[PDB]
Design a protein around this nucleic acid. Sequence first.
DNA 1: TAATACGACTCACT
DNA 2: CTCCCTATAGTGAGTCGTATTA
Length: 862
Amino acid sequence: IAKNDFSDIELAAIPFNTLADHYGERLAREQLALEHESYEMGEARFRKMFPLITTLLPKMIARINDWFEEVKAKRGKRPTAFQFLQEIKPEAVAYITIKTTLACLTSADNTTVQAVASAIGRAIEDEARFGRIRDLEAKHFKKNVEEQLNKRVGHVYKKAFMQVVEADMLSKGLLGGEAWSSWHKEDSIHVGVRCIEMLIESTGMVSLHRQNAGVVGQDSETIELAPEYAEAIATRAGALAGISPMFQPCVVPPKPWTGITGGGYWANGRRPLALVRTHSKKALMRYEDVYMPEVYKAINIAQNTAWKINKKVLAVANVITKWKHCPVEDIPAIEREELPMKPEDIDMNPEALTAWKRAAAAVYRKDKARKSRRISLEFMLEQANKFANHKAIWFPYNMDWRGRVYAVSMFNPQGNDMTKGLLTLAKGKPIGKEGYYWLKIHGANCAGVDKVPFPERIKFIEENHENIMACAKSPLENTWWAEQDSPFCFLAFCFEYAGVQHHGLSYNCSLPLAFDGSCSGIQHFSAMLRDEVGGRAVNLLPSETVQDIYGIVAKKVNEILQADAINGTDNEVVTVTDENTGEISEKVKLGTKALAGQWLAYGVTRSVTKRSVMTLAYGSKEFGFRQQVLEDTIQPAIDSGKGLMFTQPNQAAGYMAKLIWESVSVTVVAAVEAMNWLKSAAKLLAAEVKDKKTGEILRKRCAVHWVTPDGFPVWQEYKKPIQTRLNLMFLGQFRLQPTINTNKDSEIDAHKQESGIAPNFVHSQDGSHLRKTVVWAHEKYGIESFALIHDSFGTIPADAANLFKAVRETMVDTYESCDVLADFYDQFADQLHESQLDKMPALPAKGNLNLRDILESDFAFA
DNA sequence: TAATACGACTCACT
DNA sequence: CTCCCTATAGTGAGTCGTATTA
């Protein structure tokens, strides 16, 4: 076993030799150098730049080194962070702090000092451990491998790609171990804070801002990027020049997954990855000897998809993302939006200097989001520009605790529009008429043309033939593409589309065409229960038109609206009616008759119901729809000028909430019944085996276990974390005292345990769907390249027709052979419940849907 | 000796 | 009372008592 079985010296050399053995000494070296960048900036790179890093890094190192003298120069206790950091190479501490902090800033919402410190702590730990082997491993690949030139030439531009390594060909010194941290959250946060502290100190890069002082539930301390820095990142070209995301793509095929950890990345002087991302080591250990061949078969095939940067799209992004007004509206503007000026009539205590308190507060909120979207943006370019000329790059993969699959490097195929537009598949095929047809369906889908049947999508593309050519010809001048639903992707398809006109059907096209499942989850529940009406609502049945559940729900809300507008309650007097005098307040019970007309004045379209029906599979029911209706449509309607018909906001939200839940309940009955049945089971397995006095415990609280169709076993175990607060003198100014969840847990959280079951079961269930599909499309058809995004499935156009067939086939198959609920029941039967065991059960009724009809369904991709 | 950093509690919160 | 998102996490000051260390 790696751990022990080998010498730090052997461990350092194994990777490079086996990586040089296949692929060549050059790439093998480059792959390891790339990985080491996660912990240290190579003196070579840095020094060559003579880009923000060229300044940050040196100042931060000097600080760290001066901080150590300061600490050793005094009596008394040494700061806890110091005890751990004393060991780490200062050049590594600085680099990891800089990088981990900027990556955290890519977050709009969460940049509490806990989140940031936690991520620094975590990476600084990875270097304490591993750092020594990393040091040797670099000394190793620096020396030119021994003799034989034909082997070292390795790459050899063989227009056939590097193939993955065979599992058996992997030395036991490459079978990884310990993807879990072993520091106490407390020391992890300590190290983290002191790192941030010195970063602020030595550079003005970030700053600490106190948010909502004196508000028990919202008070917090957060990291903000200094304006001078945001200005350069957004204004200068390549400010993030030498600061790469922690996880980069591989320049050689990724290491195959064989065990529970160690897969994906090749270097041995690194923290290895875990096949499954869990809340704890214990939880990861459960998979240690699981045996789920099909799972590892899926992860490895995907992992093996080869990609390349889409140069034409990169050339455009590099250019227009620096314009002071961009045609792609999703691109974060460059100039700051100044605070809304005070009404001069300031002293005015009306809602004036409270509304302003909001108007301004919403501007800070938008500036933070703007600055983050910008960092994130610049990272993707930093990355695309870096691998631009590479014959190919690969992305290692992971799975979240439910099985869903994730590309591991920040810049990845699962990203937003610009990121996806910048990437395309490495090995393509001559397109063909079949392939060309889907290249067109995809171009249409990239615009907004996806709620119409295929003959129409093609019509859309053909009608706009010259626009599409004008745009591929001169994208900077002909910007009609930048206005399309998915600007950047659409453009990728435009360069491709013209390539076909210029080479005909013999054209080699590798652009990934994507097939998206209607409303995943509502599809899976309809399937497993065979709900005809539910399934038709999503798109399980061959329909002449594309069904739109958000739309059909909306038409139902509206009928209830018109009805309530005619009849329906009248505005009930005042609240002072259940008593005598007093609170004349609640001077308004607004009948359903006035409430309906309010909603009929605003409108209520597909838009009002969409953002409150897709959260259905997240546990949102009638209660939570109201505080979604309030901020998604009412609130922003008021704050924007209109919305004047919602005289009693809360009551209008409360009413719509009811109409929607009411609508969705008759719409997709199945989905509802199954989610409740699932909520019910969770409730009992969570609950504690009590009784009247003799509160003895026959059966404590249990976790929810189940296995997916392809063998992925999953364990839901929410737990209440034991908290605590650290006491840290910050910058010698004040005492920062963060509240933090500890690595120690107490009891099982029965509420979250109940709320998290339905959403987690479908997710896991479409997770293995996705896996079975990757396997099947590769074996029955010859698909080698895959573009995966949970419920979107893509490939090069010459393979689209088979992929399209393969998703249908695979889903139909899994649900005819597996009764996932029934199978679920046979898990928590003997494993759960003891005495009582009743008042819960009753498997929902299987309907009349014929899974076979899915094969012939045009709009039910996935 | 007698400085040092910080966990533990406890309050009050523009 | 939206689930994953290799997740997440009320705050600072006034006071005390401790194990450390130059």
